Amino acid sequence: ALFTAKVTARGGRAGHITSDDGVLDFDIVMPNAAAAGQTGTNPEQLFAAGYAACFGGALEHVAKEQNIEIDSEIEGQVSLMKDESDGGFKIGVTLVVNTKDLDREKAQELVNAAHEFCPYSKATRGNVDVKLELK
Amino acid sequence: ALFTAKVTARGGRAGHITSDDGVLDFDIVMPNAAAAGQTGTNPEQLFAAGYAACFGGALEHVAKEQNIEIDSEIEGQVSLMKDESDGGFKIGVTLVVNTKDLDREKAQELVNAAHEFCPYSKATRGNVDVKLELK
């Protein structure tokens, strides 16, 4: 292990998360948060944030390998969905990649390489149908 | 989609994340590259948060399905590891489930059930070593 990040979640779908280091400190909120005057995050948003960040790191590393400096914005879009197999729930993911002035052919190549490197892509491979979009 | 969470990552390993609602607004700081004492989050910490929350919520639900009102505390521990398959990186997860004032046998049963329910468990199936531990 290079490092272990620790976060404690108390109390379920209306609960609260505090990272070991205090950097993360939030309520977990339900769909009616605005109406109820609550503020916070949820597991989908946390997923979106992590995957966006993971993918940016991966894109930067693959580019580096080719001595390319990239200026990127990655929008992670994580959807909660009904799991008809189960009567339960599952996740859907889209990543919209903005690589600014990078030639598009190169952008396409590095996005694919990034998807093979990013630990979140590896963790979800074959379970989630991760859609990759360039702009 | 029931709902879609959206978060944008600017840059890479030392970049920044901002959720669309501004609730998450953080610099990316890797614990292995934070010599100046920089404050921030990372993909492993966001995943520890998210999976702790998801599992706590899953636990709550399965317990309620068994007519049990559970008070839950879950520590997610997400390690970044070397991946010898490709000389790259991968994540490992441990979840430490604290079920207070509750029978350990029933506790384990409920942990087993929450793991089938939690969408992050479904998402990572077979690709991440996920350890479920009690106390």
Side-chain angles (χ1 to χ4, degrees), chain A residues 2-9 11 13 21 23 26 43-45 60 72-74 76-80 83 86 89 120 122-125 127, chain B residues 2-9 11 13 21 23 26 43 45 47 60 72 74-80 83 86 89 120 122-125 127-128:
Chain A
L2 253 34
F3 63 91
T4 298
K6 308 199 277 205
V7 180
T8 294
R13 271 315 278 267
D21 61 8
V23 171
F26 305 91
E44 289 70 39
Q45 200 183 62
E60 177 185 68
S72 67
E73 289 182 23
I74 300 162
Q77 311 174 342
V78 170
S79 301
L80 190 66
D83 188 345
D86 204 347
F89 302 94
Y120 278 44
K122 289 182 174 191
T124 65
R125 190 83 62 207
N127 298 141
Chain B
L2 305 167
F3 65 80
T4 310
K6 296 172 171 176
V7 183
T8 302
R13 70 199 177 174
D21 61 16
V23 172
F26 294 102
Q45 195 188 59
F47 193 75
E60 248 208 330
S72 164
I74 295 152
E75 189 181 45
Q77 308 178 350
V78 171
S79 293
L80 179 69
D83 191 353
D86 68 357
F89 300 89
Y120 274 49
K122 295 186 170 169
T124 61
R125 196 177 292 167
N127 304 322
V128 177

Short mmCIF file of all heavy atoms in Angstrom, two decimals, chain A residues 2-9 11 13 21 23 26 43-45 60 72-74 76-80 83 86 89 120 122-125 127, chain B residues 2-9 11 13 21 23 26 43 45 47 60 72 74-80 83 86 89 120 122-125 127-128:
data_model
loop_
_atom_site.label_atom_id
_atom_site.label_comp_id
_atom_site.label_asym_id
_atom_site.label_seq_id
_atom_site.Cartn_x
_atom_site.Cartn_y
_atom_site.Cartn_z
N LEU A 2 0.51 2.17 -0.91
CA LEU A 2 1.11 3.51 -1.00
C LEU A 2 0.54 4.39 0.11
O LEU A 2 1.28 5.20 0.67
CB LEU A 2 0.90 4.13 -2.39
CG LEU A 2 2.09 4.24 -3.36
CD1 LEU A 2 3.16 3.13 -3.31
CD2 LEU A 2 1.60 4.42 -4.81
N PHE A 3 -0.75 4.23 0.39
CA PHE A 3 -1.48 4.92 1.45
C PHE A 3 -2.89 4.32 1.50
O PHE A 3 -3.35 3.68 0.54
CB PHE A 3 -1.55 6.44 1.25
CG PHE A 3 -2.29 6.88 0.02
CD1 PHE A 3 -3.67 7.14 0.07
CD2 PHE A 3 -1.64 7.02 -1.19
CE1 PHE A 3 -4.35 7.53 -1.08
CE2 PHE A 3 -2.32 7.40 -2.32
CZ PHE A 3 -3.68 7.67 -2.27
N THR A 4 -3.55 4.56 2.63
CA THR A 4 -4.90 4.14 2.95
C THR A 4 -5.65 5.39 3.38
O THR A 4 -5.24 6.00 4.35
CB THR A 4 -4.85 3.10 4.07
OG1 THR A 4 -4.12 1.98 3.59
CG2 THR A 4 -6.21 2.60 4.57
N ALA A 5 -6.71 5.76 2.68
CA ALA A 5 -7.60 6.84 3.08
C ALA A 5 -8.72 6.25 3.94
O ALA A 5 -9.30 5.23 3.59
CB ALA A 5 -8.19 7.47 1.84
N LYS A 6 -9.04 6.86 5.08
CA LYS A 6 -10.11 6.43 5.98
C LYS A 6 -11.23 7.45 6.15
O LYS A 6 -10.98 8.62 6.39
CB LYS A 6 -9.54 5.99 7.35
CG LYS A 6 -8.42 4.95 7.20
CD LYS A 6 -8.00 4.06 8.36
CE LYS A 6 -7.02 4.62 9.38
NZ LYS A 6 -6.18 3.61 10.16
N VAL A 7 -12.47 6.97 6.04
CA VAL A 7 -13.66 7.82 6.22
C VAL A 7 -14.66 6.97 6.98
O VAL A 7 -14.85 5.81 6.65
CB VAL A 7 -14.33 8.35 4.90
CG1 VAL A 7 -15.57 9.22 5.22
CG2 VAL A 7 -13.37 9.10 3.97
N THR A 8 -15.31 7.56 7.98
CA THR A 8 -16.30 6.92 8.83
C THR A 8 -17.66 7.47 8.45
O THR A 8 -17.86 8.68 8.36
CB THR A 8 -15.98 7.09 10.35
OG1 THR A 8 -14.77 6.39 10.65
CG2 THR A 8 -17.08 6.51 11.23
N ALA A 9 -18.63 6.59 8.21
CA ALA A 9 -19.98 7.07 7.92
C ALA A 9 -20.84 6.64 9.07
O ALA A 9 -20.79 5.46 9.41
CB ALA A 9 -20.50 6.48 6.62
N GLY A 11 -24.84 6.52 10.52
CA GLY A 11 -26.29 6.66 10.33
C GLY A 11 -27.06 6.55 9.03
O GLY A 11 -28.14 7.16 8.94
N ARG A 13 -28.77 6.56 5.21
CA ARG A 13 -29.06 7.45 4.08
C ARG A 13 -29.30 8.92 4.47
O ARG A 13 -29.32 9.81 3.62
CB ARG A 13 -30.07 6.86 3.07
CG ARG A 13 -29.44 6.01 1.93
CD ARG A 13 -28.16 6.46 1.13
NE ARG A 13 -28.26 7.41 0.00
CZ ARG A 13 -28.38 7.12 -1.30
NH1 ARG A 13 -28.42 5.87 -1.77
NH2 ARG A 13 -28.45 8.10 -2.20
N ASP A 21 -8.98 12.63 8.64
CA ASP A 21 -8.27 13.92 8.71
C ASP A 21 -9.15 15.17 8.76
O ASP A 21 -8.62 16.27 8.78
CB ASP A 21 -7.26 14.04 7.55
CG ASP A 21 -7.89 14.01 6.17
OD1 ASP A 21 -9.13 14.03 5.99
OD2 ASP A 21 -7.08 13.93 5.22
N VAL A 23 -10.92 16.50 6.42
CA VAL A 23 -11.01 17.17 5.12
C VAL A 23 -12.44 16.97 4.62
O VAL A 23 -13.04 17.95 4.16
CB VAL A 23 -9.92 16.70 4.13
CG1 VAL A 23 -10.19 17.26 2.74
CG2 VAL A 23 -8.52 17.10 4.61
N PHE A 26 -19.45 15.94 6.06
CA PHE A 26 -20.71 16.26 5.42
C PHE A 26 -21.83 15.36 5.88
O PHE A 26 -21.63 14.18 6.16
CB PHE A 26 -20.73 16.04 3.89
CG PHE A 26 -19.66 16.78 3.15
CD1 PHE A 26 -18.43 16.18 2.91
CD2 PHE A 26 -19.90 18.07 2.69
CE1 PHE A 26 -17.44 16.88 2.21
CE2 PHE A 26 -18.93 18.79 1.99
CZ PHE A 26 -17.70 18.19 1.76
N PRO A 43 -23.65 9.17 -1.94
CA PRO A 43 -22.65 8.26 -2.50
C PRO A 43 -22.41 8.42 -4.00
O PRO A 43 -21.28 8.23 -4.43
CB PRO A 43 -23.19 6.87 -2.12
CG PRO A 43 -24.05 7.14 -0.95
CD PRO A 43 -24.76 8.38 -1.38
N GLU A 44 -23.42 8.81 -4.76
CA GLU A 44 -23.32 9.02 -6.21
C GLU A 44 -22.40 10.20 -6.55
O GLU A 44 -21.49 10.04 -7.36
CB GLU A 44 -24.71 9.16 -6.84
CG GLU A 44 -25.52 7.86 -6.89
CD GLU A 44 -26.01 7.37 -5.53
OE1 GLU A 44 -26.42 8.17 -4.67
OE2 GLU A 44 -25.99 6.14 -5.30
N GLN A 45 -22.64 11.34 -5.93
CA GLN A 45 -21.77 12.54 -5.99
C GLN A 45 -20.33 12.27 -5.56
O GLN A 45 -19.38 12.71 -6.20
CB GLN A 45 -22.37 13.69 -5.16
CG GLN A 45 -21.84 15.08 -5.52
CD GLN A 45 -22.37 16.20 -4.67
OE1 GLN A 45 -22.16 16.24 -3.46
NE2 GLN A 45 -23.06 17.14 -5.30
N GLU A 60 -3.50 12.63 -17.29
CA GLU A 60 -2.24 13.34 -17.07
C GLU A 60 -1.03 12.42 -17.10
O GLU A 60 -0.01 12.76 -17.70
CB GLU A 60 -2.24 14.03 -15.71
CG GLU A 60 -0.98 14.75 -15.28
CD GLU A 60 -1.18 15.25 -13.86
OE1 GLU A 60 -1.26 14.44 -12.92
OE2 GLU A 60 -1.29 16.46 -13.66
N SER A 72 -7.09 19.84 -18.78
CA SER A 72 -8.34 19.09 -18.89
C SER A 72 -9.34 19.44 -17.79
O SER A 72 -9.00 19.90 -16.69
CB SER A 72 -8.11 17.57 -18.92
OG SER A 72 -7.61 17.09 -17.68
N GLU A 73 -10.60 19.22 -18.18
CA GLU A 73 -11.77 19.25 -17.33
C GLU A 73 -12.54 17.99 -17.69
O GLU A 73 -12.84 17.76 -18.87
CB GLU A 73 -12.66 20.47 -17.54
CG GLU A 73 -12.06 21.76 -17.01
CD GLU A 73 -12.96 22.97 -17.19
OE1 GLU A 73 -14.20 22.83 -17.31
OE2 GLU A 73 -12.44 24.11 -17.21
N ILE A 74 -12.81 17.21 -16.65
CA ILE A 74 -13.60 15.99 -16.70
C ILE A 74 -14.84 16.11 -15.81
O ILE A 74 -14.73 16.24 -14.58
CB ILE A 74 -12.77 14.76 -16.30
CG1 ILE A 74 -11.61 14.69 -17.32
CG2 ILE A 74 -13.65 13.52 -16.29
CD1 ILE A 74 -10.50 13.88 -16.89
N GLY A 76 -17.62 14.09 -14.30
CA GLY A 76 -18.16 12.79 -13.95
C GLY A 76 -19.65 12.91 -13.69
O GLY A 76 -20.07 13.80 -12.94
N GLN A 77 -20.43 12.02 -14.31
CA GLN A 77 -21.89 11.99 -14.20
C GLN A 77 -22.31 10.58 -13.77
O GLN A 77 -22.22 9.60 -14.52
CB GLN A 77 -22.56 12.39 -15.51
CG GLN A 77 -22.00 13.66 -16.11
CD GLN A 77 -22.60 13.93 -17.47
OE1 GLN A 77 -23.16 13.02 -18.08
NE2 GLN A 77 -22.49 15.17 -17.94
N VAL A 78 -22.74 10.47 -12.52
CA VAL A 78 -23.07 9.20 -11.93
C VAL A 78 -24.57 9.14 -11.67
O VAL A 78 -25.06 9.92 -10.85
CB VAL A 78 -22.26 8.99 -10.63
CG1 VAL A 78 -22.76 7.76 -9.83
CG2 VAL A 78 -20.78 8.90 -10.92
N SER A 79 -25.25 8.18 -12.30
CA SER A 79 -26.70 8.01 -12.12
C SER A 79 -27.09 6.83 -11.22
O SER A 79 -26.53 5.74 -11.39
CB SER A 79 -27.40 7.85 -13.48
OG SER A 79 -27.17 8.97 -14.32
N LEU A 80 -28.03 7.06 -10.31
CA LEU A 80 -28.66 5.96 -9.58
C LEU A 80 -29.83 5.48 -10.43
O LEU A 80 -30.60 6.28 -10.94
CB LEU A 80 -29.18 6.34 -8.20
CG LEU A 80 -29.63 5.21 -7.29
CD1 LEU A 80 -28.47 4.31 -6.88
CD2 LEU A 80 -30.30 5.89 -6.09
N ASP A 83 -32.40 -1.51 -10.58
CA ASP A 83 -31.76 -2.75 -10.95
C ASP A 83 -32.96 -3.69 -11.05
O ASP A 83 -33.44 -4.23 -10.04
CB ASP A 83 -30.76 -3.24 -9.90
CG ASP A 83 -29.93 -4.44 -10.36
OD1 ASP A 83 -30.26 -5.11 -11.36
OD2 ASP A 83 -28.90 -4.76 -9.74
N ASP A 86 -32.84 -7.36 -9.75
CA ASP A 86 -32.83 -7.41 -8.30
C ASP A 86 -34.06 -6.84 -7.56
O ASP A 86 -34.44 -7.30 -6.49
CB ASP A 86 -31.58 -6.55 -8.00
CG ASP A 86 -30.98 -6.86 -6.68
OD1 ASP A 86 -31.65 -7.55 -5.88
OD2 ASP A 86 -29.85 -6.44 -6.42
N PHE A 89 -31.01 -1.46 -6.67
CA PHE A 89 -30.40 -0.34 -7.37
C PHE A 89 -29.01 -0.66 -7.90
O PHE A 89 -28.33 -1.58 -7.46
CB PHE A 89 -30.22 0.87 -6.44
CG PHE A 89 -31.50 1.34 -5.84
CD1 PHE A 89 -31.90 0.88 -4.59
CD2 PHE A 89 -32.31 2.21 -6.55
CE1 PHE A 89 -33.11 1.31 -4.05
CE2 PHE A 89 -33.51 2.66 -6.03
CZ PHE A 89 -33.92 2.21 -4.78
N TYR A 120 -10.35 3.51 -10.84
CA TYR A 120 -11.82 3.40 -10.79
C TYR A 120 -12.38 2.62 -11.99
O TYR A 120 -13.37 1.90 -11.83
CB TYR A 120 -12.55 4.74 -10.70
CG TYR A 120 -12.72 5.46 -9.38
CD1 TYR A 120 -11.69 5.58 -8.46
CD2 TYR A 120 -13.94 6.05 -9.08
CE1 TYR A 120 -11.86 6.27 -7.27
CE2 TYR A 120 -14.15 6.75 -7.88
CZ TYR A 120 -13.10 6.85 -6.99
OH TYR A 120 -13.24 7.52 -5.81
N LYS A 122 -10.74 0.23 -13.69
CA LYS A 122 -10.37 -1.14 -13.36
C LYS A 122 -11.36 -1.71 -12.33
O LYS A 122 -11.83 -2.83 -12.51
CB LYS A 122 -8.94 -1.17 -12.79
CG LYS A 122 -7.82 -0.90 -13.78
CD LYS A 122 -6.50 -1.03 -13.01
CE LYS A 122 -5.28 -0.93 -13.91
NZ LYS A 122 -4.03 -1.33 -13.19
N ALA A 123 -11.69 -0.97 -11.28
CA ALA A 123 -12.61 -1.46 -10.23
C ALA A 123 -14.02 -1.79 -10.76
O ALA A 123 -14.65 -2.73 -10.28
CB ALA A 123 -12.72 -0.45 -9.09
N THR A 124 -14.46 -1.02 -11.75
CA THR A 124 -15.80 -1.14 -12.34
C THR A 124 -15.90 -1.91 -13.65
O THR A 124 -17.00 -2.10 -14.15
CB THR A 124 -16.47 0.26 -12.54
OG1 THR A 124 -15.78 1.09 -13.49
CG2 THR A 124 -16.60 0.93 -11.19
N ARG A 125 -14.76 -2.35 -14.19
CA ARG A 125 -14.70 -2.99 -15.49
C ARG A 125 -15.65 -4.17 -15.54
O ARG A 125 -15.59 -5.07 -14.69
CB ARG A 125 -13.29 -3.49 -15.79
CG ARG A 125 -13.10 -3.95 -17.25
CD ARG A 125 -12.80 -2.76 -18.16
NE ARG A 125 -11.54 -2.17 -17.70
CZ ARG A 125 -11.14 -0.90 -17.82
NH1 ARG A 125 -11.90 0.00 -18.42
NH2 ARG A 125 -9.96 -0.56 -17.30
N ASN A 127 -18.79 -4.35 -14.93
CA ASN A 127 -19.92 -4.19 -14.02
C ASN A 127 -20.78 -2.95 -14.35
O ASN A 127 -22.01 -2.96 -14.24
CB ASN A 127 -19.39 -4.03 -12.59
CG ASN A 127 -18.61 -5.23 -12.05
OD1 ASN A 127 -17.61 -5.05 -11.35
ND2 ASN A 127 -19.06 -6.43 -12.33
N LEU B 2 -32.64 7.85 -12.04
CA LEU B 2 -33.47 8.41 -10.96
C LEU B 2 -32.93 9.79 -10.62
O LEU B 2 -33.69 10.75 -10.55
CB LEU B 2 -33.50 7.58 -9.67
CG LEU B 2 -33.92 6.11 -9.80
CD1 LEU B 2 -33.59 5.34 -8.53
CD2 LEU B 2 -35.38 6.04 -10.20
N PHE B 3 -31.61 9.83 -10.41
CA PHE B 3 -30.89 11.09 -10.31
C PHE B 3 -29.46 10.94 -10.83
O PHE B 3 -28.93 9.82 -10.83
CB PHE B 3 -30.94 11.73 -8.90
CG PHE B 3 -30.25 10.94 -7.83
CD1 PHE B 3 -28.86 10.99 -7.67
CD2 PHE B 3 -31.01 10.15 -6.96
CE1 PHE B 3 -28.22 10.25 -6.67
CE2 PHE B 3 -30.37 9.42 -5.96
CZ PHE B 3 -28.98 9.46 -5.82
N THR B 4 -28.89 12.06 -11.27
CA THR B 4 -27.51 12.15 -11.73
C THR B 4 -26.75 13.22 -10.96
O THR B 4 -27.08 14.42 -11.01
CB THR B 4 -27.38 12.49 -13.25
OG1 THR B 4 -28.22 11.61 -14.00
CG2 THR B 4 -25.95 12.35 -13.74
N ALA B 5 -25.73 12.76 -10.25
CA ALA B 5 -24.74 13.62 -9.62
C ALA B 5 -23.66 13.98 -10.64
O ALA B 5 -23.21 13.16 -11.46
CB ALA B 5 -24.19 12.93 -8.38
N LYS B 6 -23.24 15.24 -10.61
CA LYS B 6 -22.23 15.81 -11.51
C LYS B 6 -21.14 16.57 -10.74
O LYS B 6 -21.40 17.44 -9.91
CB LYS B 6 -22.88 16.71 -12.56
CG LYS B 6 -23.82 15.96 -13.52
CD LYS B 6 -24.61 16.89 -14.44
CE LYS B 6 -25.37 16.14 -15.52
NZ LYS B 6 -26.22 17.08 -16.36
N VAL B 7 -19.89 16.20 -11.02
CA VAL B 7 -18.69 16.78 -10.45
C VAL B 7 -17.62 16.91 -11.54
O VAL B 7 -17.42 15.99 -12.33
CB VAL B 7 -18.10 15.95 -9.29
CG1 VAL B 7 -16.89 16.67 -8.70
CG2 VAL B 7 -19.15 15.67 -8.23
N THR B 8 -16.92 18.04 -11.54
CA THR B 8 -15.92 18.35 -12.55
C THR B 8 -14.60 18.38 -11.82
O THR B 8 -14.46 19.04 -10.78
CB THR B 8 -16.20 19.68 -13.33
OG1 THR B 8 -17.49 19.62 -13.97
CG2 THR B 8 -15.11 19.99 -14.39
N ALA B 9 -13.65 17.66 -12.41
CA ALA B 9 -12.25 17.64 -12.04
C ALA B 9 -11.45 18.44 -13.08
O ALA B 9 -11.48 18.14 -14.27
CB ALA B 9 -11.73 16.22 -11.96
N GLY B 11 -7.65 19.38 -14.13
CA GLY B 11 -6.32 18.82 -13.96
C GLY B 11 -6.23 17.39 -13.49
O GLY B 11 -7.19 16.62 -13.62
N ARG B 13 -3.28 14.83 -10.85
CA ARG B 13 -2.93 14.33 -9.52
C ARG B 13 -2.86 15.40 -8.44
O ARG B 13 -2.99 15.04 -7.27
CB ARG B 13 -1.63 13.52 -9.54
CG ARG B 13 -0.41 14.36 -9.79
CD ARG B 13 0.76 13.49 -10.25
NE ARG B 13 1.90 14.36 -10.55
CZ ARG B 13 3.13 13.97 -10.87
NH1 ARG B 13 3.47 12.68 -10.96
NH2 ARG B 13 4.04 14.91 -11.10
N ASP B 21 -23.22 21.73 -7.57
CA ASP B 21 -23.91 22.49 -6.52
C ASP B 21 -22.89 23.15 -5.57
O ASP B 21 -23.26 23.83 -4.62
CB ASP B 21 -24.95 21.57 -5.82
CG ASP B 21 -24.32 20.36 -5.14
OD1 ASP B 21 -23.09 20.38 -4.93
OD2 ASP B 21 -24.99 19.36 -4.78
N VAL B 23 -21.05 21.84 -3.25
CA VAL B 23 -20.94 21.18 -1.95
C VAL B 23 -19.57 20.54 -1.76
O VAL B 23 -18.96 20.67 -0.70
CB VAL B 23 -22.00 20.09 -1.74
CG1 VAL B 23 -21.76 19.27 -0.47
CG2 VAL B 23 -23.36 20.75 -1.72
N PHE B 26 -12.77 20.94 -3.56
CA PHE B 26 -11.52 20.47 -2.99
C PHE B 26 -10.40 20.37 -4.01
O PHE B 26 -10.57 19.96 -5.16
CB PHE B 26 -11.62 19.06 -2.39
CG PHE B 26 -12.50 18.92 -1.19
CD1 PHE B 26 -13.76 18.38 -1.30
CD2 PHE B 26 -12.05 19.35 0.06
CE1 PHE B 26 -14.57 18.27 -0.20
CE2 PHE B 26 -12.85 19.22 1.17
CZ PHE B 26 -14.13 18.67 1.05
N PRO B 43 -9.05 10.53 -4.99
CA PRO B 43 -9.96 9.42 -5.34
C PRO B 43 -10.20 8.29 -4.30
O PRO B 43 -11.32 7.78 -4.17
CB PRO B 43 -9.39 8.89 -6.67
CG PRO B 43 -8.62 10.04 -7.22
CD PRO B 43 -8.03 10.76 -6.03
N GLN B 45 -9.89 8.57 -0.95
CA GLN B 45 -10.66 9.17 0.15
C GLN B 45 -12.12 9.40 -0.26
O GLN B 45 -13.05 9.17 0.52
CB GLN B 45 -10.01 10.45 0.68
CG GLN B 45 -10.56 10.93 2.03
CD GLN B 45 -10.05 12.28 2.46
OE1 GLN B 45 -10.23 13.29 1.76
NE2 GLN B 45 -9.40 12.33 3.63
N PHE B 47 -13.80 7.64 -2.40
CA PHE B 47 -14.35 6.28 -2.50
C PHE B 47 -14.58 5.70 -1.10
O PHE B 47 -15.59 5.04 -0.85
CB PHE B 47 -13.45 5.44 -3.40
CG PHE B 47 -14.06 4.14 -3.80
CD1 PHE B 47 -15.06 4.11 -4.75
CD2 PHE B 47 -13.63 2.95 -3.24
CE1 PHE B 47 -15.64 2.88 -5.11
CE2 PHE B 47 -14.20 1.75 -3.59
CZ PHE B 47 -15.20 1.69 -4.52
N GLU B 60 -28.73 -0.31 7.03
CA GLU B 60 -29.96 0.31 7.49
C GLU B 60 -31.19 -0.33 6.87
O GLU B 60 -32.09 -0.68 7.61
CB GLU B 60 -30.05 1.79 7.08
CG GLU B 60 -29.97 2.81 8.17
CD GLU B 60 -30.70 4.13 7.90
OE1 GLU B 60 -30.84 4.56 6.73
OE2 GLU B 60 -31.13 4.76 8.87
N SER B 72 -25.69 2.43 13.04
CA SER B 72 -24.54 1.99 12.25
C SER B 72 -23.36 2.94 12.22
O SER B 72 -23.53 4.15 12.11
CB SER B 72 -25.00 1.85 10.79
OG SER B 72 -23.88 1.78 9.93
N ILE B 74 -19.64 2.94 10.06
CA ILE B 74 -18.78 2.21 9.13
C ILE B 74 -17.54 3.03 8.77
O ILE B 74 -17.70 4.17 8.36
CB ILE B 74 -19.55 1.72 7.87
CG1 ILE B 74 -20.60 0.70 8.34
CG2 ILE B 74 -18.60 1.12 6.84
CD1 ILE B 74 -21.78 0.63 7.49
N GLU B 75 -16.38 2.41 8.93
CA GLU B 75 -15.13 3.04 8.52
C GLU B 75 -14.74 2.39 7.20
O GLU B 75 -14.51 1.18 7.16
CB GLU B 75 -13.99 2.92 9.54
CG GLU B 75 -12.78 3.79 9.14
CD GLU B 75 -11.60 3.71 10.10
OE1 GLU B 75 -11.28 2.58 10.48
OE2 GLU B 75 -10.99 4.75 10.46
N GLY B 76 -14.65 3.19 6.14
CA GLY B 76 -14.12 2.71 4.87
C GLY B 76 -12.61 2.97 4.83
O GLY B 76 -12.17 4.03 5.22
N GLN B 77 -11.82 2.02 4.37
CA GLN B 77 -10.37 2.14 4.35
C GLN B 77 -10.00 1.77 2.92
O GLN B 77 -10.12 0.61 2.55
CB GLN B 77 -9.75 1.22 5.38
CG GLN B 77 -10.34 1.36 6.80
CD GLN B 77 -9.71 0.36 7.76
OE1 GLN B 77 -8.99 -0.52 7.29
NE2 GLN B 77 -9.96 0.49 9.06
N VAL B 78 -9.60 2.75 2.11
CA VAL B 78 -9.30 2.53 0.70
C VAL B 78 -7.81 2.76 0.49
O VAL B 78 -7.31 3.86 0.70
CB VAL B 78 -10.24 3.38 -0.18
CG1 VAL B 78 -9.80 3.33 -1.62
CG2 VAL B 78 -11.67 2.89 -0.05
N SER B 79 -7.13 1.69 0.08
CA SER B 79 -5.69 1.67 -0.14
C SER B 79 -5.38 1.75 -1.63
O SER B 79 -6.04 1.09 -2.42
CB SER B 79 -5.05 0.42 0.45
OG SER B 79 -5.14 0.45 1.87
N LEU B 80 -4.39 2.56 -2.00
CA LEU B 80 -3.92 2.58 -3.38
C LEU B 80 -2.76 1.61 -3.36
O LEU B 80 -1.86 1.80 -2.54
CB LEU B 80 -3.44 3.96 -3.82
CG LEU B 80 -2.90 4.08 -5.25
CD1 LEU B 80 -3.97 3.93 -6.31
CD2 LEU B 80 -2.19 5.43 -5.40
N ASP B 83 -0.20 -2.49 -9.12
CA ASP B 83 -0.90 -3.51 -9.87
C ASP B 83 0.20 -4.15 -10.72
O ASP B 83 0.72 -3.60 -11.69
CB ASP B 83 -2.04 -2.96 -10.70
CG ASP B 83 -2.94 -4.05 -11.26
OD1 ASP B 83 -2.60 -5.24 -11.11
OD2 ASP B 83 -3.98 -3.70 -11.84
N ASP B 86 -0.11 -5.02 -14.64
CA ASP B 86 0.29 -4.01 -15.64
C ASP B 86 1.32 -2.98 -15.19
O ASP B 86 1.56 -2.01 -15.92
CB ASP B 86 -0.96 -3.26 -16.13
CG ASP B 86 -1.61 -2.36 -15.07
OD1 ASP B 86 -1.17 -2.32 -13.90
OD2 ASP B 86 -2.61 -1.66 -15.39
N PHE B 89 -1.67 0.82 -11.10
CA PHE B 89 -2.25 0.98 -9.77
C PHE B 89 -3.65 0.40 -9.70
O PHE B 89 -4.36 0.28 -10.70
CB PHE B 89 -2.28 2.47 -9.41
CG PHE B 89 -0.92 3.11 -9.39
CD1 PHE B 89 -0.39 3.67 -10.54
CD2 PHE B 89 -0.18 3.15 -8.22
CE1 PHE B 89 0.86 4.26 -10.54
CE2 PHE B 89 1.09 3.73 -8.21
CZ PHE B 89 1.61 4.30 -9.36
N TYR B 120 -22.26 0.20 -4.87
CA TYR B 120 -20.81 0.25 -4.95
C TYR B 120 -20.23 -1.16 -4.88
O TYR B 120 -19.18 -1.44 -5.47
CB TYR B 120 -20.16 1.01 -3.79
CG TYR B 120 -20.01 2.51 -3.86
CD1 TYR B 120 -21.08 3.33 -4.20
CD2 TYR B 120 -18.77 3.08 -3.53
CE1 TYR B 120 -20.87 4.73 -4.23
CE2 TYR B 120 -18.55 4.43 -3.55
CZ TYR B 120 -19.62 5.24 -3.90
OH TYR B 120 -19.34 6.56 -3.90
N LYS B 122 -21.91 -3.83 -6.06
CA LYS B 122 -22.22 -4.28 -7.42
C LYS B 122 -21.26 -3.80 -8.52
O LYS B 122 -20.93 -4.55 -9.43
CB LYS B 122 -23.64 -3.82 -7.80
CG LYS B 122 -24.75 -4.48 -6.94
CD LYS B 122 -26.14 -4.11 -7.45
CE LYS B 122 -27.31 -4.89 -6.84
NZ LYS B 122 -28.63 -4.26 -7.23
N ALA B 123 -20.88 -2.54 -8.40
CA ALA B 123 -19.99 -1.81 -9.29
C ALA B 123 -18.56 -2.37 -9.27
O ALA B 123 -17.93 -2.39 -10.32
CB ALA B 123 -19.95 -0.35 -8.88
N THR B 124 -18.09 -2.79 -8.10
CA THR B 124 -16.73 -3.30 -7.89
C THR B 124 -16.57 -4.83 -7.88
O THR B 124 -15.45 -5.32 -7.78
CB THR B 124 -16.13 -2.73 -6.59
OG1 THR B 124 -16.89 -3.08 -5.42
CG2 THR B 124 -16.07 -1.23 -6.73
N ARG B 125 -17.68 -5.55 -8.02
CA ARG B 125 -17.73 -7.02 -8.01
C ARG B 125 -16.63 -7.68 -8.85
O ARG B 125 -16.47 -7.44 -10.07
CB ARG B 125 -19.13 -7.51 -8.38
CG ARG B 125 -19.39 -8.95 -8.04
CD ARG B 125 -20.81 -9.41 -8.34
NE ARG B 125 -21.73 -8.73 -7.42
CZ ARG B 125 -23.06 -8.66 -7.50
NH1 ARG B 125 -23.74 -9.25 -8.46
NH2 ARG B 125 -23.73 -7.98 -6.57
N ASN B 127 -13.40 -7.22 -8.98
CA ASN B 127 -12.26 -6.45 -9.44
C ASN B 127 -11.49 -5.84 -8.27
O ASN B 127 -10.31 -5.58 -8.45
CB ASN B 127 -12.71 -5.29 -10.34
CG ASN B 127 -13.53 -5.73 -11.54
OD1 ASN B 127 -13.24 -6.75 -12.11
ND2 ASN B 127 -14.54 -4.96 -11.92
N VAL B 128 -12.13 -5.61 -7.13
CA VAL B 128 -11.53 -5.02 -5.94
C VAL B 128 -11.66 -6.00 -4.78
O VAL B 128 -12.74 -6.56 -4.59
CB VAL B 128 -12.24 -3.69 -5.60
CG1 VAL B 128 -11.68 -3.07 -4.32
CG2 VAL B 128 -12.10 -2.70 -6.75
#
